[PDB]
# Entry
Amino acid sequence: MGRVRTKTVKKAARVIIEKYYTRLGNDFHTNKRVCEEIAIIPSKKLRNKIAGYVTHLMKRIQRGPVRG
Amino acid sequence: VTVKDVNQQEFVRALAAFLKKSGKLKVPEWVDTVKLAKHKELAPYDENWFYTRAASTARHLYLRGGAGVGSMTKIYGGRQRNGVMPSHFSRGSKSVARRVLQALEGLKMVEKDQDWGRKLTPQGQRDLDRIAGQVAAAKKK
Amino acid sequence: LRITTRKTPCGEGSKTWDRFQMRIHKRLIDLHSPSEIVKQITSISIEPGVEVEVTIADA
Amino acid sequence: PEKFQHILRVLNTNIDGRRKIAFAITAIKGVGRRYAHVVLRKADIDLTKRAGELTEDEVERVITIMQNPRQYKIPDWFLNRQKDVKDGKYSQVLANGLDNKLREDLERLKKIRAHRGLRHFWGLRVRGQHTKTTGRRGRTVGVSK
Amino acid sequence: HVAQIYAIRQSISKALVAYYQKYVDEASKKEIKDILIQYDRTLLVADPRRCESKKFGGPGARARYQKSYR
Amino acid sequence: NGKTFNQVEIKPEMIGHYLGEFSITYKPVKHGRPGIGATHSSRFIP
Amino acid sequence: RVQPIKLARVTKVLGRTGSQGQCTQVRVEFMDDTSRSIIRNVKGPVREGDVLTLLESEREARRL
Amino acid sequence: TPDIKLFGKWSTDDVQINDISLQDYIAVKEKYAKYLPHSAGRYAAKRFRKAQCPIVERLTNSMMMHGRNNGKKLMTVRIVKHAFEIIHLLTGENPLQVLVNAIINSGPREDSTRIGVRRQAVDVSPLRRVNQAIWLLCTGAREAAFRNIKTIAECLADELINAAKGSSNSYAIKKKDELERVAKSNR
Amino acid sequence: RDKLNNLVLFDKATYDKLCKEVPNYKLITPAVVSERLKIRGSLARAALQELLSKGLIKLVSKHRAQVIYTRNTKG
RNA sequence: AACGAGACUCUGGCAUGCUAACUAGUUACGCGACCCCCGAGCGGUCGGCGUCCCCCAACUUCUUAGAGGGACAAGUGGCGUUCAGCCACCCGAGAUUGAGCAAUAACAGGUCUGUGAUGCCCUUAGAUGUCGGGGCUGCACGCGCGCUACACUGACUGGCUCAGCGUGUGCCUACCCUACGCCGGCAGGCGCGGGUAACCCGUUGAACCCCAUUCGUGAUGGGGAUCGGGGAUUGCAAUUAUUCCCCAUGAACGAGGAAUUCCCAGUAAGUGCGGGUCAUAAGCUUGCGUUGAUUAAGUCCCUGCCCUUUGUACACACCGCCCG
Ligand SMILES: [Mg+2]
Ligand SMILES: [Mg+2]
Ligand SMILES: [Mg+2]
Ligand SMILES: [Mg+2]
Ligand SMILES: [Mg+2]
Ligand SMILES: [Mg+2]
Ligand SMILES: [Mg+2]
Ligand SMILES: [Mg+2]
Ligand SMILES: [Mg+2]
Ligand SMILES: [Mg+2]
Ligand SMILES: [Mg+2]
Ligand SMILES: [Mg+2]
Ligand SMILES: [Mg+2]
Ligand SMILES: [Mg+2]
Ligand SMILES: [Mg+2]
Ligand SMILES: [Mg+2]
Ligand SMILES: [Mg+2]
Ligand SMILES: [Mg+2]
Ligand SMILES: [Mg+2]
Ligand SMILES: [Mg+2]
Ligand SMILES: [Mg+2]
Ligand SMILES: [Mg+2]
Ligand SMILES: [Mg+2]
Ligand SMILES: [Mg+2]
Ligand SMILES: [Mg+2]
# Structure
């Protein structure tokens, strides 16, 4: 199966959130474009994975705060 | 009716009788001692095979112009069983296909094409359409 | 173009192979113009190892 | 229909009238399928009959066409002994002349002691096949003393 | 001879469903779309199965030649 | 034949054969006794 | 030695038993009084909800 | 009928699966009624996708076996076709009910596993009951018409008939009875 | 193998029995008629085509690999 | 913190959205023409068939190939220390295509017969550096990879109707792919053209499969070994038959002992087609399509692999060591 993200994806998503916290929402097709415009991801698959982990983190930051 | 609107296996059967009902379409002399292709083992069962193959060649020329001997011999080519070794594809017999096309020209049914090859005449399209209509009206298709 | 060779000299080992291949791309352009202007425009800005062939009558 | 005598004794060989003619006369040597079909077509007799349905005025015609083929327009490229090595004839050798011709050909070869005769004498393979791993008629050899 | 029967049978359905959605009403096409897609898919949606490539060391994509110790 | 000029007296029966078809290039073999590698039943030495 | 047949419905899949992992432990009720339950070893591809037929229902499965 | 496909001729309503276990694993009627036992059929994709397959296409698939029959399915549809007509003549009952009864009469419900010649008895899942029934019914027709003058279509109908009319004269019912006897010994 | 000595053509006894079986058989195929009598099986085809011509049996299916008849579409 | 995994590259699946095409097409009618009434009708007008001919017609659906798009466990329900994640489902072209590349450390693995890579030793004019002839193919026997079969879910004879990946005129080196006419039963021959190729062979009329005949459980019309006689082609030369064609002869074999190999979906198996070697030539291998199942969704029993704890008289490492 898989679907376990790698440290290169998780660290990128954590930095993207920790800097542009107020531009990111709850839908995936907008976070994709935001991360596309604020960073430089040298692939499209990596862009989708980073933007998909950003959404899963945002859905949690609306609850109690995460520890990273 | 058109030729494409009727079952072709009955069309060939009717056209074979049409051809072997006139007395024309002079057959070769070696009709009883010929194997019909390299990849065969016996002579054709049907004694009057030349009229069936003439009808088949004519209905094939109705469907594609400019056919010529080198394609009739590909249209009748099949599989050859090389005894103990694997099988392969094989051509028909140039002599048979050439004599069939020459015997059809002897009926004003076909003519040599403008580009090299053979083609139906206007008089041949009519003879095929009449037999198509006859077959269609017979079986009430 | 494809060439599939054995990977080893000498014929020993597991029987692996290598698959090399070259790819040739081709395009054509058609113009209706005097030949002088054609030689004017076709002989400028040819950077890579692309071919450029000019034929005087094809239509 | 017409349970009449079926077992035929054609020249030096037994035919069973229980089979179709084109496959019954192949029981004779020198007569295969491709030959028998032509011999039956030239003789104008039917081809859906069992071999017992032939009265004594058909079998005779069939065999006299089977033995003198070039008379009845059977071609040359179709006969089993062409340009006969010692007489220049064209013929189908049929029933017992077949074994005699074969033995005469083997003896001719062995006489001048050509190579084919020497392979026929030693009971080996006459064409160019490998004999290291095929044929294999004898018994197993023991390696432990 | 058999991959073309399915092509024809899918194409004429894909045609009648497209003609009903451009020159007729919308419900008049979504009725026949459901009538077709309930009895059987592959009447409107093609299937992506394709042949797989042969690899060296076997007569096909997955089979291997016979191993032989001793 | 590769080492030796074996002699032949030409007879009117050999007309149209090859002269090479009358002196063989090898000895017709008579077998010995099978040696150490001849079967899987045989391997061992000290 | 004389017992009728008993149909039993599967309500839980426990695990794969046997040397090759070739059969499955399954808990069943008895189609007549749901207050009964036993554990059996089934040979085929059993889902949850299927109905098994028992030629001998007074037995119970230990393992293997 | 304009909305009810039969088989061309064989109506698929009024056919009763008289088992409570084997239904939901025999797809005869009311949603799996189709004109021919031939679909694209990506049924070997997930675990239980196989039970949704029509039963006549589960027999057509299994009948083409032993080497020089693989992929020859248009030859294996005409076999089932010619056999259903033979069945309708010899008996008179709807040929699908004979097939259902034959599938029921020939799937074993007890069987035995080699364990630790030690065997231990176990009970058969319904899907495996259907699979074993189909395999046994096809092997009987295969072995019956291997060197006979009878055809593969006469012997398939013979098998189906002797199985639906439980008689022990069919290969499938002899085999079922052996597996259940051998399993009863190892109980 | 075995020895199946079938008859290549009929005799009068078998020939009358072949017409006295017509109302009896629900399924008629060449193989069944081969197994009932001792018939060469390629004679059974001709016998059934002859019986069909005389309206004595009814054709329910004909195919290259199979032919099926039944008794007069009755019972 | 670094390498390997992953990311990455090629490939298969989707776009009626973009870009744009007589070396690709569609539709339209300009058409024109053939043919049949097959329909109303008359046969005409309307239609029906066309790889029959045209368009400086309109377009890109099918073909081509570029740019972008699109899938992320994103949505919903369960299970999760509510974390990492797992199962199911809606929507969808798709919710798990297939390959390429690949680490530290090592093996007395293979290659001196790929090399104008190479150390040392040997030979060097009676040569271990060139022409003619023979061998590498010889046959009591043991073994490995494979081809064809053991027939009726078949063989034979006719009829019908569908592909994809490729290659194609050679410099030294002299040979390429073929259309179409004629001649010959056949292999093959003669004569005239096209193609350095989306242009010609070619709309690649492939085989299995499909539809009808004959056979009838008999080593039979299953099988095609072995052998006789004749005819062609390549080549400087065919005998120890190079390859091909024709008539004839018609062996074992009726599903295979103990053992043992490969395989999860467009996959196994059946089936044919190209490339490689190739003056001549595939039962080999390397790719391509075509028909298309049964069985699994597991386990550690057998054979092995990875990580932890433990024991050791081993370290040439259990194929070890070692006692009388
Ligand atoms: Mg394959
Ligand atoms: Mg660290
Ligand atoms: Mg969730
Ligand atoms: Mg859906
Ligand atoms: Mg992958
Ligand atoms: Mg490595
Ligand atoms: Mg080296
Ligand atoms: Mg050296
Ligand atoms: Mg070498
Ligand atoms: Mg030299
Ligand atoms: Mg030399
Ligand atoms: Mg060698
Ligand atoms: Mg090998
Ligand atoms: Mg055929
Ligand atoms: Mg085969
Ligand atoms: Mg090949
Ligand atoms: Mg070539
Ligand atoms: Mg080749
Ligand atoms: Mg090789
Ligand atoms: Mg193994
Ligand atoms: Mg591990
Ligand atoms: Mg330790
Ligand atoms: Mg030590
Ligand atoms: Mg030890
Ligand atoms: Mg000692």
Remarks:
- Residues 3-19 of chain E form the longest helix (17 residues).
